[PDB]
């Protein structure tokens, strides 16, 4: 339960071996199951020992110490497992205290492009492995897309502000090492329409399921019905959502038609009944006149006249009883007419307003995936859901910048230094860079390996900002073009004081139009100070970046005034506005599996580039250009924990190569 829990935190199955363990321990997986169990226990126990105190290094000696028999036998086995878990970053990763002071005898040289979480993690690991590492950053700061505004006692994350659960999250360990305060968030997102009036509980809950149900319906339309290509072209989540909505409206309509058709059927059957009853009535009238003309022949009569009277009597009674039967049926049909007239099917699927609120929900989905739903693949947009961490999603109250900065201690970061060209050959690598302040100052860094952590938005740039010599192969460039890089933005609003409900962490705004469903759609409180963050998502983001600061802040204050009152919003003290797609060093926000791509493209973008032979007929060169980043991890994309996992992985790979 404890060792197994260690397997769980480390994203490893506790009861079987992984492919990397089968590759580094091919002898154990290929032999007796008992020895496999032994290996698995040594793994899980070393991992538990590390995770129970991540602020100190775990040495092979301590591991064997703290092991018992029969698992303290095969000292080579234990040493092998420790080495594996250390090289791949499952133990002794992050900011820990070194028990074995490193060596000044450093082997190999690597240039890491980028000082984000990916690059910083890779650099720390490669330095601990004994290599010389120099990071080249264009910005004047570390962290990259982990950015924290800090003015006075105002602190607010402009990039990453969240940990998507701590159950199996690497960041958990880091949080114990950096002392970063994590705070929960409260479900409650009271929605408020344009008028400023809240949405009634009963329509809010309606619409919220209709949203969940429509998403499940897109999933069903993809996985059972195979509606993943249309017009020779791949389908998106938005196209499927609109197809589903259209079919629901069709259903309303058709049910409708069937109800009115039952009504017509019953009506016209009443028609025939009544019509027969009119005829029968005139006939009874005539027969009654005849009975009266016959029964006024005086009582002294032959038997033919008596027969006339009595036969007309019988015929009259028969026809009258038939009329009474038709008249009972008249009522048993009018009754069903007014039953059906009184249980009408539904008129609409979704009212205009209902639909605006559905648009708010769609905008939340667009915000978390940082892209218009028209850009996401219906079949592979949720391919990362099977690997979600367990627990409650949390926020960073002190500034999540705390992580990158702490990871940059003792590393050789060259800030304000922007790479222009990466040259890789069978003898080494040459990174050309410039000074962001004086472009004319050129720098040449020669290396045994390069680790590119450049954002996908930078790698997508055409005209290119970084040139690769020799040019990067097509199997990589097409993946770069296929994969999606999104955009989301924030508006940090600092204030005199709290004018909102301190008990609610999220409160929303429903937009007037579907096209404006992302325009300042959510306001968020998560700090000690009087700060509110206004979130911009979807197609709105890319447009809102071409609107002045003051105009955005004014729209924000306007909706806040409509919500809480013009007398309760003070004018903001400090205001910040994000523009991530315009950032020349980001070119957007985070990746999204786009229509036409898959998770195999992440893996392709994580594959190392191996140069060609300089001399013809020379032994195959070794790989030289390695890649890491959030756009390189399939099972955990577009996240900080994904970037750190990528950095650790690439550090392990590079060391496996150049250190053995």
């Amino acid at each position: 339960s404890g060792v197994e829990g260690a397997a769980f935190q480390s994203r490893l199955p506790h009861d079987r071996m992984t492919s990397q363990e089968a590759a580094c321990f091919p002898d154990i997986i290929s032999g007796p199951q008992q020895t496999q169990k032994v290996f698995l226990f040594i793994r899980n126990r070393t991992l538990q020992l590390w995770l129970d105190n991540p602020k100190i290094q775990l040495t092979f000696e301590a591991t064997l110490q703290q092991l018992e028999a029969p698992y303290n036998s095969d000292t080579v086995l234990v040493h092998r497992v420790h080495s594996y878990l250390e090289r791949h970053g499952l133990i002794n990763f992050g900011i820990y205290k070194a028990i074995k002071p490193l060596p000044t005898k450093k082997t190999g040289k690597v240039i890491i492009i980028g000082s984000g979480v990916s690059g910083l993690a890779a650099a720390r690991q490669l330095q601990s492995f004994g290599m010389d590492v120099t990071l080249l950053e264009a910005r004047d700061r570390v962290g990259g897309r982990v950015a924290t505004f800090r003015k006075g006692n105002y602190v607010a994350d402009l990039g990453a502000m969240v940990v998507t659960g701590l159950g199996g999250n690497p960041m958990a360990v880091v949080s114990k090492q950096v002392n970063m305060e994590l705070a929960k968030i409260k479900q409650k997102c009271p929605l408020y329409e344009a008028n400023g009036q809240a949405v009634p509980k009963e329509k809010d809950e309606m619409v919220e399921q209709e949203f969940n149900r429509l998403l499940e319906a897109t999933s069903y339309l993809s996985h059972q019905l195979d509606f993943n290509v249309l017009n020779n072209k791949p389908v998106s989540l938005g196209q499927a959502l609109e197809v589903v909505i259209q079919l629901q409206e069709k259903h309303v309509k058709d049910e409708q038609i069937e109800h009115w058709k039952k009504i017509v059927k019953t009506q016209e059957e009443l028609k025939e009944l009544l019509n027969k009853m009119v005829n029968l009535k005139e006939k009874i009238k005539e027969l009654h006149q005849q009975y009266k003309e016959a029964s006024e022949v005086a009582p002294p009569r032959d038997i033919t006249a008596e027969f006339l009277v009595k036969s007309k009597h019988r015929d009259l009674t028969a026809l009258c009883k038939e009329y009474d039967e038709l008249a009972e049926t008249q009522g048993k049909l009018e009754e069903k007419l007014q039953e059906l007239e009184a249980n009408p099917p539904s008129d609409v699927y979704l009212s205009s307003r209902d639909r605006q609120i559905l648009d708010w929900h769609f905008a939340n989905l667009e915000f978390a995936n940082a892209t218009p739903l028209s850009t996401l693949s219906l079949k592979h947009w949720d391919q990362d859901d099977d690997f979600e961490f367990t627990g409650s999603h949390l926020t960073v109250r002190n500034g999540y910048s705390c992580v990158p900065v702490a990871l940059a201690e003792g590393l050789d970061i060259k800030l304000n230094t922007a790479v222009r060209q990466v040259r890789y050959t069978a003898s080494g690598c040459e990174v050309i860079a410039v000074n962001t302040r004086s472009t004319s100052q050129t720098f040449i860094y020669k290396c045994d390996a390069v680790l590119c952590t450049l954002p996908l938005g930078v790698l997508k740039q055409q005209p290119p900002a970084v040139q690769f010599v020799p040019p990067l192969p097509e199997w990589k460039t097409s993946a770069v073009q296929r994969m999606g890089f999104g955009n989301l933005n924030k508006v940090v609003l600092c204030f005199d004081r709290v004018f909102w409900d301190p008990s609610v962490n999220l409160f929303g705004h429903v937009g007037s139009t579907t096209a404006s469903r992302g325009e300042l759609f959510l306001f968020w409180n998560l700090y000690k100070a009087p700060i509110l963050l206004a979130l911009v998502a979807g197609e709105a983001a890319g447009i809102m970046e071409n609107i002045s600061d003051d105009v955005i802040v004014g729209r924000c204050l306007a909706i806040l005034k409509g919500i809480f009152g013009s007398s309760a919003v003070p004018q903001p003290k400090e205001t910040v506005v994000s523009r991530w797609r315009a950032d020349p060093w980001a070119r957007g926000s985070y990746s999204y599996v786009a229509a036409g791509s898959s998770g195999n493209d992440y893996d392709l973008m994580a594959q190392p580039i191996t140069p060609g032979p300089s001399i013809p007929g020379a032994p195959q060169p070794i790989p030289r250009l390695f890649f890491a980043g959030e756009h390189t991890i399939r099972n955990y994309p577009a996240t900080v924990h994904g970037a750190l996992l990528s950095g650790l992985r690439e550090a392990g790979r590079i060391a496996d190569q150049f250190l053995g």
Partner: protein
């Protein structure tokens, strides 16, 4: 296995997707169908209203009071004559010939017209009823 509250079938998807405007066309055609049905509902409602206006007054006024008669078994000469005539007119609705006689039952009528066969040439009377 689609979701609950969602109605999605192969065919309908293909219909709404086959063309760039197929969706709006289908929906708005059904729209039109609905108007058509309700135009005809109002038509027939006015028709039936007129017919019911006709039937105002019911049949109460040419009804004849009901009378009960204890079913005897002695055929009076008058009753026999009435029965012959009621055969000639009603053929073999003997319930009805009991109704016209009023003092006979359906089995007594059925008997009668073996009882008297030869004597009232009832075969010939029936033949005549059938032309």
């Amino acid at each position: 296995k689609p979701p609950a509250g969602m109605f999605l079938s192969q065919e309908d998807v293909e219909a709404v997707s086959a063309n760039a405007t197929a969706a709006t066309t289908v929906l708005r055609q059904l729209d039109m169908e609905l108007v058509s049905v309700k135009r005809q509902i109002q038509n027939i409602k006015q028709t039936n209203s007129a017919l019911k206006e006709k039937l105002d007054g019911g049949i109460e006024p040419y009804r004849l009071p009901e009378v009960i008669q204890a079913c005897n078994a002695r055929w009076t000469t008058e009753e026999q004559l009435l029965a012959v005539q009621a055969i000639r007119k009603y053929g073999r609705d003997f319930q009805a010939i009991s109704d016209v006689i009023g003092n006979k039952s359906v089995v007594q009528v059925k008997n009668f017209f073996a009882n008297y066969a030869r004597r009232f040439n009832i075969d010939e009377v029936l033949q005549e009823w059938e032309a």
